[PDB]
Amino acid sequence: RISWVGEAVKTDGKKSYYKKVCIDAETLEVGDCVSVIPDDSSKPLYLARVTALWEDSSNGQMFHAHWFCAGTDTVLGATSDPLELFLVDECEDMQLSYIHSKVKVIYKAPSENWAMEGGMDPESLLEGDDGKTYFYQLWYDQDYARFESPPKTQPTEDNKFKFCVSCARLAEMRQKEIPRVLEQLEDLDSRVLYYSATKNGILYRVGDGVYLPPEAFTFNIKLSSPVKRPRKEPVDEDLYPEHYRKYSDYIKGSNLDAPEPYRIGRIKEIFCPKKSNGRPNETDIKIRVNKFYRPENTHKSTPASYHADINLLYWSDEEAVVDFKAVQGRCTVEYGEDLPECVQVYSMGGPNRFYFLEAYNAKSKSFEDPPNHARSKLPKLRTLDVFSGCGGLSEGFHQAGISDTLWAIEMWDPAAQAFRLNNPGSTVFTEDCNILLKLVMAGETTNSRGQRLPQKGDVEMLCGGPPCQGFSGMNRFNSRTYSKFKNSLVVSFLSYCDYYRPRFFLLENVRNFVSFKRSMVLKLTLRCLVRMGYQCTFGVLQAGQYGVAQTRRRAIILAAAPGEKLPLFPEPLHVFAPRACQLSVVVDDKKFVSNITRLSSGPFRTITVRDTMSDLPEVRNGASALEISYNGEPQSWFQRQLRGAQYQPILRDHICKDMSALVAARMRHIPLAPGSDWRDLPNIEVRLSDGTMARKLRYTHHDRKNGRSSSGALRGVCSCVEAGKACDPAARQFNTLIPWCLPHTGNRHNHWAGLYGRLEWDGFFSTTVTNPEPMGKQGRVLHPEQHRVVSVRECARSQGFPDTYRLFGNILDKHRQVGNAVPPPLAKAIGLEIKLCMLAKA
DNA sequence: GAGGCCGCCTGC
DNA sequence: GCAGGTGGCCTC
Ligand SMILES: CCc1c(C#N)c(S[C@@H](C(N)=O)c2ccc(C(F)(F)F)cc2)nc(N2CCC(N)CC2)c1C#N
Ligand SMILES: [Zn+2]
Ligand SMILES: [Zn+2]
């Protein structure tokens, strides 16, 4: 009934391998594909390739199954082609009696003319099927939701008869993870020294720099205990009646909980303890390092970090011993006064680069000079940027060195003009992107302005951020909203990708793009890319982790053409508040993360509001001078980067909105202490700059939930604070310094935390918005000390724009251009991941 | 033109 | 309950 076809081919102990087996009326050979029924009969069939066939002396006839992954089991879910399978690194030994039948599974490889095969309508992208047998084209990573071209892992001549691609790749991954020593240096009395060791694919040698977690070692600086902020001191509750609403100790935009960046050391020794027989215990690798000081680790403490370069260190003679498994990565730490090039071009020429010029003596608290023993392109992609705005994403890609944006599409004219001023060689289209694509597909060569349209082969990279108006809710699709989606700018952008078939594709959006419409927007987007034959992935990034003093999470979809390497997401560069770094995504109860491994720390300290704008001159509410003096040199590393190399005599766009007299009076009475907002306003009369008056807020109803003040005063300002009573229109009070509407509805809006809120010098910006309004949702827009809202220039700094980047229009147009942009430091980090793929292409 | 006003949903 | 995430549209 089940019988081997022939004789054995290898007797490996208790296993007898065969090349062919006959089951009932069928014959199976290595390489065939088969189905297996699960224990749950309602579940669909399991499908696998047979990689080996053998008899076991105890268990009987066996085979090795290299499982396929059904499309529904991927992030695509039910949007998947019902007959599409995906390769995965999942396999197991199995008895032959579990085999149900033989199946045909074909490999649908992209053609050599794949770049010219695009042009299918949205219905075919969204809902079209291959309409054939079972097939696969892509390999799938279930943890990271990555679709990639199938691996080309070659067999041996030894294991060809039983070769399993999944087994080989799993073995490669396991060995790549375990730390190993390579080249033995010297045999000591108690340890064996080594010249080099490897971990996670990285080579470590004596003298190399290593990243370590902050807990790896301490410094010999006997720290002093900072004066911990006491409990909220009692205030005069009649002068500040709304101060009680600050019972939460949480401060928006505060950096009190951001982790320390990495400890940094230079490898002095790589060693293993010796067993009694003299052999080294190579399963327990240790390293000895010299401790490097960051400026803030010295006695000068945190203020030493204000002016210092973010990659400046101080050599020291202190030493520590840590486990090799604790090393978080490799870095370069060089003596500055021996570099072939200047420090700035060194620091900008590669990742993980640090430098030192002096040494630090903790006992002496002095800075001597270091001892003697401390010393030893690609053509850019032609890019089309859709929904470009003023050009933040293009600017970051340009800094990464990967792109020339030769075409841009921007329908809002002030942003289009801004893009032109910064990109004089680019062609900027103002038409609706559907119109342009229709013209190109009709065979047109120029638009109605005479501008040459991009044709197939011109576009090598496509990037953009499409709005999602009409389907940015969380509720499920219905027939109405699904119609709006297939006619949406998201789908139009995907049609550009299908038509032009660039080498690389990038879609950026608000974080909730991954959750819109029960994640169907994300799932359909990935479905379209797979249907085109693209490798693709998705993830969420926090802009503050790449060098801005701003919390801004963005959803990122990356795609790479067949023949390309699919980029990884960039590792965080700066530590940031952990509350703002929630990057995981749940799709259909399956949790997805990106390849990012820096979860607890990072190489550089967090960028603060101080780093962002401490150098800008004081200006008034309503400041309108477009060109002023800086009044001094840049003070921080961040300011030195954004001001640039060439001296800039003129500071542009340090202008602020002209708030009304009442609002200006409110801002003038928000205290400067961190976390101050409308709840710290005094309840007083104040004469305004226009002769009018601001009135005392009167408490006219009893709020049983909130109680009464210490002097017995009420805390409700309307009858609606009762259970069922409605807002009595006579209870509305006007022109009060404490705005009436905030105590009115504060009980159900978390007390309107942050409204009329001041930024904190040591903290970060909330998400930079298109129109700073102190009483809007993102109300924390007051300057840390000046009685005004943040200026256009300050908002640009919070986005990481260079001071030379030109904006266009009135002040509200400039705020909108800044607030809508992708921060260039985030775009640059993504661009450098793309550059790695350009250089590694086979 | 700008300022007052303020719902619904989700993750924890 | 707390905190984050989406502007819009009333009226002057
Ligand atoms: C916290 C501030 C705020 C905000 C804020 N920020 C918003 S945003 C909201 C709105 N403005 O309608 C919205 C939602 C979705 C879209 C989309 F279509 F684009 F998806 C557009 C606007 N709504 C709010 N309330 C609901 C609408 C009105 N009853 C007034 C109160 C409130 C409030 N209090
Ligand atoms: Zn296997
Ligand atoms: Zn009311």
Nucleotide nearest to A512 (CA to C1'): C5
**Cα-based distances in Å from A137 to A81, A109, A124, A226, A557:** 12, 6, 18, 59, 20
CA A157 to centroid of ligand 2, rounded, Å: 17
Ion ligand 2: residues, Cβ under 5 Å: A 91, 164, 166-167
Write down the catalytic residue from A69, A167, A390, A468. Answer: A468
Backbone angles phi, psi at A315, to 5 degrees: -65, 150
Q: What is the DSSP letter of A342?
A: -
Determine if ligand 1 sits within 6 Å of the CB of residue A614. no
With the most atoms of ligand 1 within 8 angstroms of its CB, the residue from A742, A747, A773, A777 to mutate is: A777
**Residue numbers followed by a gap, chain A, C–N over 2.5 Å:** 376
Whose tokens are 């290593």? That residue is A210
CB A493 within 8 A of CB A386: yes
Backbone angles phi, psi at A256, to 5 degrees: -70, -20
Backbone angles phi, psi at A162, to 5 degrees: -135, 30
- The enclosing H or E element of A65 equals strand A60-70
The distance (Å) linking the CA of A226 with the C1' of B12 is 31
Whose tokens are 């040698």? That residue is A205
Alpha helices in A384-448 (DSSP H): 392-399, 413-422, 433-441
Would you say how long chain A is, in residues?
A: 842
Nucleotide nearest to A770 (CA to C1'): C7
A536 is catalytic: no
Determine if ligand 1 sits within 6 Å of the CB of residue A484. no
Q: What is the DSSP letter of A611?
A: H
Among protein residues, the one whose C-alpha sits closest to the C1' atom of B12 is A579
Nearest ligand to the CA of A726 is 3
- Give the C-alpha separation, A208 to A703, whole Å: 65
- Give the C-alpha separation, A675 to A580, whole Å: 17
Among protein residues, the one whose C-alpha sits closest to the C1' atom of C5 is A512
Residue (of A784, A806, A786) closest to A796 by Cα position: A806
For chain A, the C-alpha Rg in angstroms (whole number) is 32
CA A50 to centroid of ligand 2, rounded, Å: 10
- Residue A150, CA atoms < 13 Å, CB-side half-sphere: 17
Alpha helices in A188-251 (DSSP H): none
A641 CB contact with strand C at below 7 Å: no
CA A425 to centroid of ligand 1, rounded, Å: 40
A73 CB contact with strand C at below 7 Å: no
- The enclosing H or E element of A537 equals strand A535-542
Question: Structure solved using which method?
Answer: X-ray
Tell whether A388 is in a known binding site: yes
Q: Please state, as a whole number, how many other Cβ atoms lie within 10 Å of the Cβ of residue A313.
A: 24
Long-range contacts of A814-819 (CB under 8 A, 24+ apart): A814/A653, A814/A655, A815/A657, A815/A770, A815/A771, A815/A772, A816/A414, A816/A415, A816/A770, A816/A771, A817/A389, A817/A390, A817/A414, A817/A415, A817/A418, A818/A390, A818/A768, A818/A770, A818/A792, A819/A768, A819/A769, A819/A770, A819/A771, A819/A795
Q: Which two tokens stand for residue A737?
A: 């310094």
Within 7 Å of a protein beta carbon, the nucleotides of strand B are 2-12
- DSSP output for A480-521: HHHHHHHTSHHHHHHHHHHHH--SEEEEEEEGGGGTHHHHHH
Alpha helices in A619-673 (DSSP H): 637-643, 661-668
The torsion defined by the Cα of A665, A667, A669 and A674, in degrees rounded to 10, comes to 180
Among protein residues, the one whose C-alpha sits closest to the C1' atom of B4 is A741
Nearest ligand to the CA of A750 is 1
CATH of the domain at A412: 3.40.50.150
Determine if ligand 1 sits within 6 Å of the CB of residue A472. yes
**Cα-based distances in Å from A68 to A35, A88, A138, A356, A570:** 10, 6, 11, 52, 29
- Give the C-alpha separation, A42 to A287, whole Å: 55
Residue A604: domain span: 381-608+825-840
